[PDB]
Design a protein around this ligand. Structure first.
Ligand code: 3UO
Length: 346
C-alpha cells in the first residue's frame, strides 16, 4: 500500500526527509532499469521514480548531473533515495522526478496515425522550449547525447515541454574522448555515425533538427536500421559531404566511397503548406560541419519562433503560453546580446 522512504531532496543541502508514496505502477522499462509512477501522500502529486542499479565504485553520473540542473524546461528531480528490490545485496538508486503525462513521441504519433500534421504553433512551442533546455545544459558543458521524441515530456494543458533522461548525459571536455555509440536511431549526428570520439554538444542540435523535421514531415527525416541507410537518407537531402566536410567529422572516412548526390532543395523535402521559416531553421540545424550548426540559443532567436514573441499569442485551448522569456544570465552566457531578441518588450 504505502511506501515510506527517507529521501534526499534533489536541490539544496543534503538533508533527507521521510517521504511517503503509494499507487505504484510501472510506466517504463529500459536498459537502465525501470520507471515507476507513484502518488506522494503529502501533496497527492504524481512522480516518476526511475530505479537504476547503483554500482558501486563511484557516484552515479546521472544523479550528479540532475542535482545541478534547475530549469522550467528540464524534468525536475524532487528526490532521490537508495533501496533494495531485485538482485539483493546490490543497491539501487531511485530518482524521484515530477511526473509529466505525455511525450512528443506519443503526441506526434497520434497525429501521424490520423494522417494529420501537428499544427505549427505546437511545433514552434515545443521546439523553442527544447532549444532553451539545450542552451541551458550546454552552458554547463553538459551534453544530453540522447535527444529524441520519447525524451521530450509534455503537459498538453499548458504546452510545457520538459527534457528528460539524462542517463546518457555527459560533461564534455575538449580533448577528453567520449564514446561515439550514444544517441538513438534517426537522431544520430553524422559524426556519430562515422564513430567520432571528439564530438561536441552540437550533436544535441542535430538531433533537435531531426525532431523538428519529423514534426513537420509526420515521420522521421533520416530513417534506417543501419548507419549506412541513415547516411544515405542524409546524403539524399544534404548532398555528399565534401572531403573537408568529411574531415570535420571523420576519423579519416576520407578516401571511402560515398554515393555522389547534389544537395536536394530543402523546400522540396516538406509539404508545400510548410512555412519557409521552418525549413530555413532545419537547414541551419542539420549541417554536416558541426560548428556550422546553430547553437541552441541562436535557434531560440530564429525568426521561425517570432509568433511566440507576439504579445497577442495564445494556445489553441485558449489559455496563455508558458513562460518563454524568463531567461537567466546563465542561459544567455553563450551570446548575451541575443537578449535583445529573446526577451520581447512585454
Ligand atoms: C521512459 O522514460 C524515461 C526514460 C529514461 N529516463 C527517464 C524517463 N522518464 C522520466 O524521467 C519521466 C519523468 C516524468 N514523467 C515521465 N512521464 C512519462 O514517461 C509519461 C509518458 C508516460 C517520465
Amino acid at each position: 500500500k504505502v511506501t515510506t522512504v527517507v529521501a534526499t531532496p534533489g536541490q539544496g543541502p543534503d538533508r533527507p526527509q521521510e517521504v511517503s508514496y503509494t499507487d505504484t505502477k510501472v510506466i517504463g522499462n529500459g536498459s537502465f532499469g525501470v520507471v515507476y509512477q507513484a502518488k506522494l501522500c503529502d501533496s497527492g502529486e504524481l512522480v516518476a521514480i526511475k530505479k537504476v542499479l547503483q554500482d558501486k565504485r563511484f557516484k552515479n553520473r546521472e544523479l550528479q548531473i540532475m542535482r545541478k540542473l534547475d530549469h522550467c524546461n528540464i524534468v525536475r528531480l524532487r528526490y532521490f533515495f537508495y533501496s533494495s528490490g531485485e538482485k539483493k545485496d546490490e543497491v539501487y538508486l531511485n530518482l524521484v522526478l515530477d511526473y509529466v503525462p505525455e511525450t512528443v513521441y506519443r503526441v506526434a504519433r497520434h497525429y501521424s496515425r490520423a494522417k494529420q500534421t501537428l499544427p505549427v504553433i505546437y511545433v514552434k512551442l515545443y521546439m523553442y522550449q527544447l532549444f532553451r533546455s539545450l542552451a541551458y545544459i550546454h552552458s554547463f558543458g553538459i551534453c544530453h547525447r540522447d535527444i529524441k521524441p520519447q525524451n521530450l515530456l509534455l503537459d498538453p494543458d499548458t504546452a510545457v515541454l520538459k527534457l528528460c533522461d539524462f542517463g546518457s548525459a555527459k560533461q564534455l571536455v575538449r580533448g577528453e574522448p567520449n564514446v561515439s555509440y550514444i544517441c538513438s536511431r534517426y537522431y544520430r549526428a553524422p559524426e556519430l555515425i562515422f564513430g567520432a570520439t571528439d564530438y561536441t554538444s552540437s550533436i544535441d542540435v542535430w538531433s533537435a533538427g531531426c525532431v523538428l523535421a519529423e514534426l513537420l514531415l509526420g515521420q522521421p527525416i533520416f530513417p534506417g536500421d543501419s548507419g549506412v541507410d541513415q547516411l544515405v537518407e542524409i546524403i539524399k537531402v544534404l548532398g555528399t559531404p565534401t572531403r573537408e566536410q568529411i574531415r570535420e567529422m571523420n576519423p579519416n572516412y576520407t578516401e571511402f566511397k560515398f554515393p555522389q548526390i547534389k544537395a536536394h532543395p530543402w523546400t522540396k523535402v516538406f509539404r508545400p503548406r510548410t512555412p519557409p521559416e521552418a525549413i530555413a531553421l532545419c537547414s541551419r540545424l542539420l549541417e554536416y560541419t558541426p560548428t556550422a550548426r546553430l547553437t541552441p540559443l541562436e535557434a531560440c532567436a530564429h525568426s521561425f519562433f517570432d509568433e511566440l514573441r507576439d504579445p497577442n499569442v495564445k494556445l489553441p485551448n485558449g489559455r496563455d503560453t508558458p513562460a518563454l522569456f524568463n531567461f537567466t544570465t546563465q542561459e544567455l552566457s553563450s551570446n548575451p546580446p541575443l537578449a535583445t531578441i529573446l526577451i520581447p518588450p512585454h
